[PDB]
Structure formats: structure tokens, C-alpha cells
Design a protein around this ligand. Structure first.
Ligand SMILES: *[C@@H]1O[C@H](CO)[C@@H](O)[C@H](O)[C@H]1NC(C)=O
Lengths: 40, 22
């Protein structure tokens, strides 16, 4: 069908781990850059 | 004043509105 489809590449982003001081705490926060969690 | 093969533009920590606030 003579229709136009835009192609944008698969989402990629550096995973950054937000870590409070290991002695202070053990919980973890993970960051997915420039990606909405709907895709995640 | 007026790139997807693994090249990522990390946003500034201070947003343009926040830089304007400074
Ligand atoms: C992520 O959420 C929806 C995906 O359905 C999208 O429309 C929205 O623009 C995205 N948010 C961003 C890129 O900040």
C-alpha cells in the first residue's frame, strides 16, 4: 500500500544505578535513560 | 541558535528553565 512509514531505531539507553552509600544503605534505584517505562 | 547508532545525548542536569532560574 502506497503509505509512508517512519522508522526510528529500537530504544537504547545507558542503565545508571543510583546507589546510596553501601554502609548507609543497600537499596538500589535503577535509571533507564531517555526511555519511558511503557517500553520497559 | 539552532545520531542514533549508539550516540546518546545525555540531558544537562540543569534544565534550560532551571539555568534560566540561576
Ligand atoms: C513515553 O510514554 C508514551 C508511550 O506510549 C509516549 O507517548 C511518551 O511521549 C513517552 N514519554 C516521554 C518520551 O517522555
Amino acid at each position: 500500500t502506497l503509505e509512508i512509514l517512519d522508522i526510528t531505531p529500537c530504544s537504547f539507553g545507558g542503565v545508571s544505578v543510583i546507589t546510596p552509600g553501601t554502609n548507609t544503605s543497600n537499596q538500589v534505584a535503577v535509571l533507564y535513560q531517555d526511555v519511558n517505562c511503557t517500553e520497559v | 541558535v539552532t545520531k542514533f547508532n549508539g550516540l546518546t545525548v545525555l540531558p544537562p542536569l540543569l534544565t534550560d528553565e532551571m539555568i534560566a532560574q540561576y
